[PDB]
Amino acid sequence: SHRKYEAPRHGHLGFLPRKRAASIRARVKAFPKDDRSKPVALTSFLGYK
Amino acid sequence: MAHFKEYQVIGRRLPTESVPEPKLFRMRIFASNEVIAKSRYWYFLQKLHKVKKASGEIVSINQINEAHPTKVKNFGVWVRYDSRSGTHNMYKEIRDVSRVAAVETLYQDMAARHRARFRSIHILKVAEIEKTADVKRQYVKQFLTKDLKFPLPHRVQKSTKTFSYKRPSTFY
Amino acid sequence: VEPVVVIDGKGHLVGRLASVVAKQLLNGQKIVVVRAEELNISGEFFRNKLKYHDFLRKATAFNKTRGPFHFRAPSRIFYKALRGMVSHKTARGKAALERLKVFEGIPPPYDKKKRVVVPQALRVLRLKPGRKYTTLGKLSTSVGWKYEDVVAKLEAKRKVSSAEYYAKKRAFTKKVASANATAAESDVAKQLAALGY
Amino acid sequence: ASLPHPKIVKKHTKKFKRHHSDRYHRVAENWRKQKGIDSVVRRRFRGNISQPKIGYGSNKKTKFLSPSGHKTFLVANVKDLETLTMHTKTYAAEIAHNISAKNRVVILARAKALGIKVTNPKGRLAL
Amino acid sequence: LRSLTTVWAEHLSDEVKRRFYKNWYKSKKKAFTKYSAKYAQDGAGIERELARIKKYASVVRVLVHTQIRKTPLAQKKAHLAEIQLNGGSISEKVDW
Amino acid sequence: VAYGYPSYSTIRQLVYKRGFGKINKQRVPLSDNAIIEANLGKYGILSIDDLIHEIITVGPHFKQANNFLWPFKLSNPSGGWGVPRKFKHFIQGGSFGNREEFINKLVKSMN
Amino acid sequence: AESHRLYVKGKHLSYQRSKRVNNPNVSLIKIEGVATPQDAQFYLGKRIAYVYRASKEVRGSKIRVMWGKVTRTHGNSGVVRATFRNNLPAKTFGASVRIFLYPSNI
RNA sequence: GAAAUUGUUGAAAGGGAAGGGCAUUUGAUCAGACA
RNA sequence: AGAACUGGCGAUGCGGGAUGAACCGAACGUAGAGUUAAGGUGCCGGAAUACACGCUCAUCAGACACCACAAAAGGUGUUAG
RNA sequence: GCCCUGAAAAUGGAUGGCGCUCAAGCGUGUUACCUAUACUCUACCGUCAGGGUUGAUAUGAUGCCCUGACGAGUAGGCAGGCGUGGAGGUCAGUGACGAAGCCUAGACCGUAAGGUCGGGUCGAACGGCCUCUAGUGCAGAUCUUGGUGGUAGUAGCAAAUA
RNA sequence: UUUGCUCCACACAAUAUAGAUGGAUACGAAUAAGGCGUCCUUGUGGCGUCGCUGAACCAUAGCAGGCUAGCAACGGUGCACUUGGCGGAAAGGCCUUGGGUGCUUGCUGGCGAAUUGCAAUGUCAUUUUGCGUGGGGAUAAAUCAUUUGUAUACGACUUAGA
């Protein structure tokens, strides 16, 4: 039968699997869309919290 | 039913001492053999008069060939057909060479356009229209138009092999 | 008959091509299908799109990673249609599907090679004119294939180079035809004409 | 050195093994007919073992014959072998298992004399 | 997107050279030696590879690393990463 | 059953190929007018042609000749039955009933 | 020359079978160039070899042969029935076989 | 001094069971025959 | 749930109906050859991507018995009357 | 008539699937082709029935031979055979130069029950045939007794301040 | 880390073969429209021809293909080299210059080929590995243990250590 009090989903499923990362250095899965008119520059940098 | 033929079937009561020489009813039957022809003869005569195969006799079964199997004719066919809900009469025009070919096309056309079957169809009359303008139907009249010509676009071959090397063409 | 048969999937119907291909495979012919983004399906684009959405909502409810995998590229759509026509859960079917190869576009080892067609699967011969048809690249892009632009760019490049090759080949063919034509008067040529050749 | 016989046919060279003799050790391979109400083997559904029956019977010309075309007759001594003196084409001798080696060599000598075939001549022979 | 080739510098520091090892104290520290020797007069093979990148290479990424020794961590091993370049002319990118 | 009106050719071929007698409960291949005479000389029949004659020109002794004849054990027809479905009437596009003279073709296929 | 072939090359298709039961005592062969039984009638009675290679040499050869013959036609698309002395091993579904031109009647 | 059950060695196979039947291949192994 | 007449399952395999106790076909000694039943012949799958006449386009097509469903009512959708 | 509206359910999803659209759909027709343990012919096995065969050397006449047909099966009935412990008889049977038992992806006979041989181990008795006799044949019975597994080197071996 | 590892050439074994045995012979697009050739005023142009299938084209004669002699022509093809260019979608191949060398069935000839004994695939392919000889080339890491805590049930991860 049905839930009896319609409450919402605990947790976010698009953050699954909630597993260990392969490295401490996370992957940049995307860079900004390139504009072939501006100067040449880096899109990102590396630092330490 | 099959590739058709036309038979004339002549039939008779059995003679009694009371009434000898009965009246010799005949019918033109479209059928694929003499057995089916005699069956249909008795079907229709049973319907019309007090006769059956047991009290009756078949006097002669004769095949009727076309007198002119090369002259292209325009037949009109008067038909009776049982539908699912009801039974109906029809007049169809068929342009063909022979009565028997016309009847073949008629059975196929009624099966196609009315889902009617041989058991369901009675052919009342098949008649040649001698003069044009007595034709009632456009799908026949447009071939009686004067000096008729037309192409066959999109010509498709039939290939012996499975693979080809040309990317063929539908020319004509 | 050839050891490897290269089929140009342009203008072709998916199910019919898959049928003849599957049978050729099981009978032992190595086949490679190319330019499968230009493959055709009968019925309008919206119809086939709804059909694919129906396929795409089918999934194992306790693990969609277990479920039926919905492959989005045209090559793998064709492979789906075709492994449904092979008994792929056996060794014979595995071997057949190893004889098979499918590609989007025409990659380098197979663009310098002759492409055959299959006339019992071509849409321009098999469909009635007026009947609406769908293109697999369009469908696959609608349902989530990304590399439509890339294949187009690369195919343009290929067509340029192939046209150059054909210009050269046509010139050489012209020369050979002129030479044979001037040679088609002598006694040897007359004897060959008598013998059919 | 036998009579001329036809080629020998068998119709089933394969031992009729009992159902589930492979599955359980307690079930031996010796044939037993399944007598169960739901037995696929008794009902002879497709894909199941064959049951023995008399149509697999061997031709009577070729029954009991060995591939040499002799019928094998067990022998314990020279008297039992002189029984076969006059039937060397039909019958071959087989020395019994419980015979000693010295008696075996005696029997084999007498059989070589009388022209009788012996199926187990290498039994209990010092090499 | 597929990596076609990747060009390195002549002199790599002992931090990225460290990144290429799991046991630096035991090693002969032989890494990028034959590459530093591939330079050797002008960078013939190197300009070959850069020309390949210029000709091909829809996009271009630069390999960089960190100055962990300037950082107060006890790690000594730098973090290598690919970073995309944005700007016209993959030629200009690779020349940069 | 499929039945109809046979011809001399069918009768002759059937009696010559599938023709077997009933003698002392036994199905005897005829193969000799001596046999036929030994069993039917009571009735003047003394040859396989005398048999066929009684059969086709139904005679005083048709009963005895026909019961002497063991039932003809025919094969299936070699070109098939001609129809897709057998168990309709011949008139409906089947195989059973009277097929007055189309039975000869069937029986020759079966023989 | 280049060619030394006195055999027409064919392909071993399935065994004789219904939808769910096969018969290994009869094999089906597809012959090249044949597309009708009227053309396969030429090939009836001709002898067939399935030639295969092993690793163990028996009597001077690592090449072994199964001999058969064509028995009758199959279907309408030139497929042919064959029967071999010892039946074919069912891993040769799609394998090449050699239809020789003897026994000849031309 | 059986079996279940186990160890060692050898041989073979192994993509969510194994086992069986018909048929052949491959490997191993084996009986029978000309005077 | 209960009767009638037959046939069957039970007690029975086989080919077909994807699958099924009883439906279709047909009843099993062991083998060989041939022909067929019912059902089928794009591929899975043995066998015509055969031939012929027509109807149908479904932004919920349809697809051959028992059998696994669909109605009243409607539609210048199209077809024939 | 086909198509459409009418036409709404609960895991994901079934003209059997793929897929099919002048179709691989619907209606009808024509042929070819596929194939069952069915039909035909042949062989072999058994069963039944009908018959022949004193001729002897010399034999099983409860034999040999010929002919024809048949062959599904639970419960159940009958028949012919296989095997086990013991009894009478017989083979002047086997056997410490090795009985019986045990093992043996080694061989042979029999439709089968089962029998026979070879090799190994073994260490004292055992068998074939004609007959008698029965505490005579196991897969089950939450069967009896005994032994052994997987579970599994797992649960766990943590109250009582050390 | 015993003078081991690897590439190439040759030789010998083993390994198996989803399975050669003349050639996978390269435009693109349309199809109620196109290919080829040709001409001009270069176009959505004019003229001619083609297609109705690849049953085409190419190659193909020689002891599984031998040894020799000329004629004609300066062509064709193979091998190993050599020049230069194009190749990135899986380029790993395509084209090209030059010379050398072999063959040439384009034509005419000469010798040989028997006995595998009336057929038996009658073996003339590809792959993988190993051991030998010849040359060429290069002379590292990872794990355990110790340690760290950006980590952690244990593994694992992250670090450090001549």
Question: Three-state SS string across chain F, please?
Answer: CEECCCCHHHHHHHHHHCCEEEECCEEEECCCHHHHHHHHHHHCCCCHHHHHHHHHCCCCCHHHHHHHECCCCCCCCCCCCCCCCCCCECCCCCCEEECCCCHHHHHHHHC
Whether D23 CB is under 7 Å from strand H: yes
**To which H or E segment does residue C188 belong?**
helix C187-194
Calculate how close chain A gets to E43, using CA atoms only, in Å.
24
Residue with tokens 């064509």: G70
Tell me which chain C residues have a C-beta less than 8 angstroms from the C-beta of B170.
124-125
Say if residue B133 is in the same domain as residue B120.
yes
Reply yes or no: is the peptide bond before residue F71 cis, omega within 30 of 0.
Answer: no
**To which H or E segment does residue B164 belong?**
none
Q: Which residues lie closer than 8 Å to C46 by C-beta, 6 or more apart? A: none
Say if residue B75 is in the same domain as residue B65.
no
Task: Look at C11 and B159 and tell me if their CB atoms are within 8 Å.
Answer: no
CA C60, CA C71: separation in Å to the nearest integer?
15
Q: Is B139 left (phi over 0), alpha (psi -120 to 50) or beta?
A: alpha
DSSP state of D11: S
Long-range contacts of G56-60 (CB under 8 A, 24+ apart): none
CATH number of the domain bearing residue B114: 3.10.20.10
Calculate how close chain C gets to G59, using CA atoms only, in Å.
31
- Give the C-alpha distances (Å, rounded to integers) separating C121 from B115, D89, G59: 31, 73, 51
Task: Look at A38 and E93 and tell me if their CB atoms are within 8 Å.
Answer: no
C-alpha gyration radius of chain E: 15
Kindly state the tokens that stand for B92: 């169809």
Asked whether the beta carbons of F15 and F51 are under 8 A apart, the reply is yes
Angle between helices C14-26 and C91-99 (to 10 degrees): 110
**Cβ-based burial of B77 (10 A; exposed 0-12, middle 13-18, buried ≥19):** buried
Task: For strands C30-34 and C100-102, give the pairing.
Answer: parallel
D101 half-sphere exposure, CB direction, 13 A CA radius: 6
Long-range contacts of A19-28 (CB under 8 A, 24+ apart): A25/E79, A25/E81, A28/E81, A28/E83
Q: Which of B18, B50, B69 is the last residue of a domain?
A: B69
Kindly state the tokens that stand for A6: 């319609």
Q: How many domains does chain B have?
A: 2
- Smallest CA-to-CA distance from D122 within D103, D101, D92 is with D101
Q: Is B167 inside a domain boundary?
A: no
The three-state (H, E, C) secondary structure of C10-46, written as one string = CCEEHHHHHHHHHHHHHCCCEEEEECHHHCEEECCHH
Tell me which chain F residues have a C-beta less than 8 angstroms from the C-beta of B2.
93
**To which H or E segment does residue B5 belong?**
strand B5-13
Say if residue B30 is in the same domain as residue B53.
yes
Asked whether the beta carbons of C139 and C45 are under 8 A apart, the reply is yes
Say if residue B24 is in the same domain as residue B82.
no
Say if residue B61 is in the same domain as residue B74.
no
Q: For G62, list phi and psi in degrees, rounded to 5.
A: -95, 5
Whether B159 CB is under 7 Å from strand K: yes
Say if residue B54 is in the same domain as residue B93.
no
Candidates E19, E59, E70, E84, partner chain A, best to mutate (most A CBs within 10 A): E84
Q: Is G96 on the interface with C (CB under 8 A)?
A: yes
- Give the C-alpha distances (Å, rounded to integers) separating C33 from C22, C39, C120, D3: 12, 10, 16, 68
State the structure-solving technique. Answer: cryo-EM
Q: What is the dihedral of CA G97, G100, G105, G106, to 10 degrees?
A: 100
Q: Is B158 inside a domain boundary?
A: no
Say if residue B38 is in the same domain as residue B19.
yes
Q: For C33, list phi and psi in degrees, rounded to 5.
A: -100, 135
Q: For B164, list phi and psi in degrees, rounded to 5.
A: -130, 165
Q: What spatial distance separates the first Cα and last Cα of chain C, rounded to whole Å? A: 23
Q: Is B161 inside a domain boundary?
A: no
CA B43, CA B53: separation in Å to the nearest integer?
9
Amino acid (one-letter) located at C155:
E
- Smallest CA-to-CA distance from F100 within F2, F5, F9, F1 is with F5
CA B50, CA B66: separation in Å to the nearest integer?
32
The three-state (H, E, C) secondary structure of B65-124, written as one string = CCCCCCCCEEEEEEEEEECCCCEEEEEEEEEECCHHHHHHHHHHHHHHHHCCCHHHEEEE
**To which H or E segment does residue B140 belong?**
helix B138-144
- Smallest CA-to-CA distance from C136 within C37, C8, C6, C26 is with C37
DSSP state of G104: P
CA D74, CA D94: separation in Å to the nearest integer?
5
Structural domain including B134 reads 70-146
Angle between helices C136-143 and C148-183 (to 10 degrees): 170
Asked whether the beta carbons of F65 and F55 are under 8 A apart, the reply is yes
CA C20, CA C23: separation in Å to the nearest integer?
5
Give the largest Cα separation in chain G, rounded: 47
Q: Is B77 inside a domain boundary?
A: yes
Angle at G73 between CA G67 and CA G76, to 5 degrees: 140
Q: Is B13 inside a domain boundary?
A: yes
Asked whether the beta carbons of F4 and F110 are under 8 A apart, the reply is no
Asked whether the beta carbons of D73 and D91 are under 8 A apart, the reply is yes
Interruption sites in chain A after residues (C→N beyond 2.5 Å): none
Question: What's the Å distance between residue G47 CA and nucleotide H35 C1'?
Answer: 39
Q: What is the full DSSP assignment across A1-49?
A: ---SS--PPSS-GGG------S-SS------PPP-TTS--EES------
Task: For strands F97-98 and F2-3, give the pairing.
Answer: parallel
